Amino acid sequence: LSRFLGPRYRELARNWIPTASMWGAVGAVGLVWATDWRLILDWVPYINGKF
Amino acid sequence: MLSRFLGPRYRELARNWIPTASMWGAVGAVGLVWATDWRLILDWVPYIN
Amino acid sequence: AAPTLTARLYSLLFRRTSTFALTIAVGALFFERAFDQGADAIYEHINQGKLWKHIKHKYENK
Amino acid sequence: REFGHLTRMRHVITYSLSPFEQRAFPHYFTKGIPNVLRRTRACILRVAPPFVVFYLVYTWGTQEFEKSKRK
Amino acid sequence: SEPEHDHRKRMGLKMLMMMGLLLPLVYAMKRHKWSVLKSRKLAYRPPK
Amino acid sequence: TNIRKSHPLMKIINNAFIDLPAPSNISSWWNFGSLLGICLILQILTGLFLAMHYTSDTTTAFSSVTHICRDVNYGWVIRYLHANGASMFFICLFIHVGRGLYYGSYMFLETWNIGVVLLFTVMATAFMGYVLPWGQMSFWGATVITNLLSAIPYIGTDLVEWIWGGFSVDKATLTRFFAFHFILPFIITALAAVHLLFLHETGSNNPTGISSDMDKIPFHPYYTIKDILGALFMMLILLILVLFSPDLLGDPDNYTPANPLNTPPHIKPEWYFLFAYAILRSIPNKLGGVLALVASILILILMPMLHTSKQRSMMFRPLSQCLFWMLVADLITLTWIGGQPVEHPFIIIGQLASILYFLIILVLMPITSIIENNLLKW
Amino acid sequence: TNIRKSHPLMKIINNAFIDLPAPSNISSWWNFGSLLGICLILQILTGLFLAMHY
Amino acid sequence: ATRKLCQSFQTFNICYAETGLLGAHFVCDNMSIDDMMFFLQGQWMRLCTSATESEVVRGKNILRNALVSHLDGTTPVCEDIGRSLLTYGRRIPLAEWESRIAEVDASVVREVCSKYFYDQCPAVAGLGPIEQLPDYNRIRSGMFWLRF
Amino acid sequence: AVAASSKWLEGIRKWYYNAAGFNKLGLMRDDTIYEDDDVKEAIRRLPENLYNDRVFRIKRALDLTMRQQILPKEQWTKYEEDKFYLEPYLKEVIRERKEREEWAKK
Amino acid sequence: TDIRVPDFSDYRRAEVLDSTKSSKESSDARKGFSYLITATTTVGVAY
Ligand code: HEM
Ligand code: HEM
Ligand code: HEM
Ligand SMILES: Cc1cccc(-n2nnn(C)c2=O)c1COc1ccn(-c2ccc(Cl)cc2)n1
Ligand SMILES: Cc1cccc(-n2nnn(C)c2=O)c1COc1ccn(-c2ccc(Cl)cc2)n1
């Protein structure tokens, strides 16, 4: 349509993106401590996960 | 404590409420006589045995 | 005039907003062996000689 | 949204009769079946022909599965 | 495999004679209330 | 000093059910939303009796179910209420969704979106309960699902290992299928009260789509008596199936106990999952099947955004309702194909009709709403 | 256009727990009513685990 | 008066040769109609039952005062002479009016109010901003009580 | 934009008018429109004789569908007598929205 | 003074069709059973 694109919303998307990424990498690394994702606890070896 | 009850014209509200009241005193005399299948008043009427 | 000229039972029965919910309790009687007719009369008529109380007299008295 | 706050209306009149001044069934089968026959002739040209397209696929779809197992 | 076969065909008779009573008697409570709306008339009288 | 208007409990009941302004021309299709709340309370009461006698153990579970049908008092009438009171839930649910799609009711966006969440949580609860009798259809339906759940490339293979209890099929296998099956119906309940808090902001739609604030009537006595008449007509048809043919809808092969050493002739789900099973087997991949499954229920959220008509309802749109019954006659075709063997004719029909389900909603509907605008001169 | 004051779900939470007028000198004895709601949710979660094995 | 529900209300007792009208009229704003109808109908039903012997004595004093105050000059007396001869066929004196007021008490009032009001269909008229005028089903159900 | 076979697009515009049936309830085309926020502003700007004509036409049609009834075929709204009473008022409300939007992109 | 209530003779009772002389009598010669439609409902809701 023509409601949505212009020089306004995508420069509101300019300072969005860091927000999106740290809303996305929050969802990425935050999912792995709740549901016991053992395939990503390997990648940082400093955290002794299960005993 | 309950002198809400005492008055020369609050007892007006009772003697026409009892001709209504007298009959719901016997809604158990039909209702729970049926409903538990009680042994009480079944052989009183000769139709229901 | 010509239509039903009997008594009116809406100045006592049902009219009460209470009775709308009291005929789960006060209106909950009178009709169990009036419908031990029909139910236990047409079931034991199509099923003639097939149930256990229709044949048990053979193996009742020795 | 309460009753005296919904809209604004002017110049309309309504006449209504009591439930005890009316017979129960005014016109039951002298008016009933010419009213249902009007609503059937309208919405059966939109509803029914999609469902005869399922039928011709069902009758063809079990006439190929039964020749798929024989000669 | 189906020991309740006879007990269910008679219990399915003790409710078919109870829906021949109860169902005409809520349908007539329904047609009583809705007859106010079913008979009403409307008129529009604006200034000429 | 009307106590119906000033009491703290009684105000909420009076505002929601008694004095509520309702449109005057509400038809019979608005009755199936209270029938869903009747079917939900019935499945919760009947299900709590069946939970007092069930044992979750893959050796002793087929025998716990026969114990209620042959030893426990009224156990044959309470069990066959439950298996048939879930077919009634699903027939009321598909009429309810087709109403809101026809009369444009998805324009209540916050009400429609909670509805699509309710359609997932219902379809998942009826899956966890059918595995619990543990027969030859309960085993070979759960291993068809978990194969399509270990194809998700990053979480899929460690997730099916958790639901089976860490093993394949033992005592602690059915303990997790039984626990999620007990809990999710009490979440369907709470999501249905939030569902009606958002409908209260606008009130109801009506078959004409046009707003009706001039012509409101109160809800009581007009729809408190019309809904009661519809709820007793539902319990008539329900108790006909419990007492005259309680095995009409199920399958005989679930009366053979669960044993992998033998194999059933066919794999067949219940009648209300057969449309979603004809779409899994239509895509020859374990990734394009689990994605074409969830796309069939998630496509309902795009319905507010795909509407390109000037009018709200389909009462005055005769070309748009000609395509509404092609969509209903295609979910019938996907229910017949979903219980056939995977043979020559039953796959060319299974994939040419899994395409047409998506071509009607996403493409053919928004283009026909535009041709209608152009013929009405907008 | 405060979303805490106009959203249909969020109004009820805002009226009951956020913007509620409360006396300023409420002491520690008013804490045991929310501790009863803590003790009640704990007995329901723990009790559902114990019912799977009894 | 306490809840400013209306501007005015009045009762009427219109009579004819064979029939009559018995009821009330009130004037209010658009947000007060449903509450005025609730309180009026609840006082009709409190006279079919429950009518006290003190209410009837005041209502009999009010009726005698309305009789003699209406005949205070040659013009009101001449119209009570001219239309009593066309309705009753005679002019009822003021002694025959008072000996009929002396007989009435609470049992007669309860019996005569139940005969005319109890469980009957009213006629209703409304004009103006009247969207809160209640439905006729909810009106007709106000013509009983929930206890007696 | 046809000029020779404009006979054909006039028959299809009439046919869709009568296949639709808002005229059988005695409605006009601008009665049946879905009210979003633009349409709710165009209704507020109507002259009062046009607003009162629309509220009664809608109330008579909600009442006709409560009883599954149709008006007789003498009170059906004709094709060449439907007045587009709302389309001049609505084209100006949309044009004032597309101007406050091109100004926020500056 | 120009409006009149329209006639309801397609919805009248069997007898009040003629509006001459049923003033107060025949308010129960009109009437003794469809009030009792809800009475036998009580006995039908009953068991
Ligand atoms: C457990 C499941 C559900 C329950 C208990 C439920 C309950 C209800 C109730 C009681 C109503 C009001 C009565 C009515 O209009 O019929 C209603 C309306 C509605 N429901 Fe549901 N519902 C459920 C699932 C769904 C689903 C799956 C959808 C759609 C995807 C949905 C969408 C709607 C809509 C749009 C309305 C308003 C329709 C209108 O007023 O026109 N609901 N619901
Ligand atoms: C809300 C909707 C519900 C649906 C759709 C549903 C569905 C089902 C289904 C289809 C079965 C299989 C029955 C069979 O094939 O014999 C089943 C079984 C079972 N369900 Fe439900 N159920 C619901 C709610 C509940 C609730 C709330 C509980 C527990 C409180 C429950 C407990 C059980 C139990 C114990 C079984 C045992 C196996 C059996 O008796 O067959 N269900 N459920
Ligand atoms: C709400 C407050 C509750 C209280 C005060 C309470 C109290 C108790 C007590 C005193 C016992 C005996 C403990 C013992 O073994 O010495 C017990 C046992 C038990 N309770 Fe609860 N309970 C509550 C809620 C629940 C709930 C909600 C459930 C189930 C969903 C539940 C299920 C059980 C079970 C299965 C047992 C037997 C297991 C055992 O003896 O440890 N309880 N409860
Ligand atoms: C709460 C709410 C909000 C918004 C709309 C509507 N609603 N739904 N349909 N219509 C026309 C509406 O106005 C509702 C009412 O929801 C329903 C549906 C059935 N019942 C019900 C029936 C009988 C009895 Cl005894 C009790 C309740 N309540
Ligand atoms: C394959 C097979 C064979 C035998 C029985 C059963 N089954 N399992 N439960 N019930 C009632 C059955 O009929 C099945 C499962 O069939 C399907 C198809 C799609 N789903 C599904 C869709 C959404 C969600 Cl969220 C969960 C599951 N299930």
Side-chain angles (χ1 to χ4, degrees), chain F residues 29-34 36-37 40 89 93 96-97 99-100 103 105-106 108 111-112 114-116 118-119 122 188 192 195-196 199 203-206 300 312:
Chain F
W29 301 117
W30 271 250
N31 207 344
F32 289 91
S34 65
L36 284 167
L40 182 68
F89 205 109
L93 204 64
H96 201 52
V97 165
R99 194 274 325 254
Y103 291 119
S105 317
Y106 43 81
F108 306 140
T111 301
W112 178 260
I114 297 183
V116 189
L118 280 165
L119 191 48
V122 162
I188 295 167
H195 187 63
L196 286 174
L199 195 61
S204 304
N205 195 23
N206 41 265
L300 294 182
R312 176 172 193 178

Side-chain angles (χ1 to χ4, degrees), chain H residues 53-65:
Chain H
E53 295 274 19
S54 286
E55 298 184 344
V56 172
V57 156
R58 168 182 57 97
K60 277 159 50 159
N61 278 332
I62 286 168
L63 192 56
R64 305 172 178 134
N65 267 306

Side-chain angles (χ1 to χ4, degrees), chain F residues 1-2 4-5 18-19 213 218 220-222, chain H residues 3 34-35 38-39 131-132 135-138:
Chain F
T1 322
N2 201 338
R4 208 174 29 95
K5 289 176 163 50
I18 305 177
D19 275 326
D213 279 20
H220 179 62
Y222 292 101
Chain H
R3 306 128 44 95
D34 170 84
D35 211 354
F38 174 77
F39 278 105
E131 211 173 9
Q132 211 182 300
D135 202 82
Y136 193 64
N137 273 318
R138 317 276 306 258

Side-chain angles (χ1 to χ4, degrees), chain C residues 2-61:
Chain C
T4 64
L5 16 85
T6 357
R8 13 106 280 304
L9 253 80
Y10 224 41
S11 323
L12 43 124
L13 212 264
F14 189 78
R15 63 164 232 210
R16 253 42 155 263
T17 333
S18 90
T19 53
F20 236 136
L22 236 57
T23 72
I24 351 247
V26 129
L29 351 213
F30 307 98
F31 265 82
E32 190 176 359
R33 99 280 194 234
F35 280 100
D36 290 329
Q37 174 72 321
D40 291 331
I42 236 128
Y43 187 66
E44 286 85 356
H45 179 252
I46 267 115
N47 305 37
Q48 190 55 249
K50 277 157 62 173
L51 311 185
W52 177 236
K53 292 181 199 189
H54 292 182
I55 63 176
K56 78 184 306 181
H57 60 85
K58 300 183 193 296
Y59 356 90
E60 272 327 78
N61 292 13

Side-chain angles (χ1 to χ4, degrees), chain B:
Chain B
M1 183 178 286
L2 53 96
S3 65
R4 42 197 197 147
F5 177 76
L6 280 79
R9 279 198 175 84
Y10 194 77
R11 280 80 182 267
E12 299 276 322
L13 301 178
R15 79 279 185 272
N16 289 337
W17 185 64
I18 306 288
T20 298
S22 42
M23 296 198 235
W24 62 264
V27 300
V30 177
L32 60 100
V33 173
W34 179 271
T36 323
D37 201 0
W38 273 136
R39 79 286 191 202
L40 299 172
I41 317 169
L42 282 185
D43 213 344
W44 177 69
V45 279
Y47 296 105
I48 331 291
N49 291 116

Side-chain angles (χ1 to χ4, degrees), chain I:
Chain I
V2 301
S5 65
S6 177
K7 298 223 299 185
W8 194 86
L9 211 64
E10 242 5 350
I12 312 296
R13 282 208 181 106
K14 277 186 57 63
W15 177 88
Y16 183 86
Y17 192 79
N18 314 342
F22 52 89
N23 64 338
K24 296 173 185 183
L25 307 188
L27 293 154
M28 283 169 170
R29 181 214 78 187
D30 289 343
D31 291 292
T32 67
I33 208 163
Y34 167 60
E35 45 160 276
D36 48 359
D37 279 357
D38 287 350
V39 168
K40 279 211 286 287
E41 174 62 35
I43 292 301
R44 209 198 53 101
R45 294 177 178 194
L46 287 156
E48 199 198 39
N49 72 289
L50 288 185
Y51 170 85
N52 282 334
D53 283 4
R54 163 197 169 88
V55 178
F56 174 71
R57 270 188 313 247
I58 285 171
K59 198 214 175 72
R60 187 179 56 161
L62 303 170
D63 176 78
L64 272 170
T65 51
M66 189 200 56
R67 310 194 199 92
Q68 295 101 33
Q69 291 272 28
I70 296 301
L71 286 187
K73 190 176 159 60
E74 290 90 34
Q75 311 183 42
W76 287 0
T77 306
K78 284 196 179 57
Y79 173 60
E80 59 266 12
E81 294 191 323
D82 199 316
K83 299 310 170 187
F84 305 146
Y85 64 93
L86 200 60
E87 194 170 5
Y89 297 82
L90 182 64
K91 282 175 179 306
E92 194 67 32
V93 179
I94 291 168
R95 200 183 333 177
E96 288 159 46
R97 191 179 34 86
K98 300 219 195 99
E99 186 186 1
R100 306 195 303 276
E101 277 167 354
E102 292 290 309
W103 201 281
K105 291 181 250 220
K106 309 300 193 295

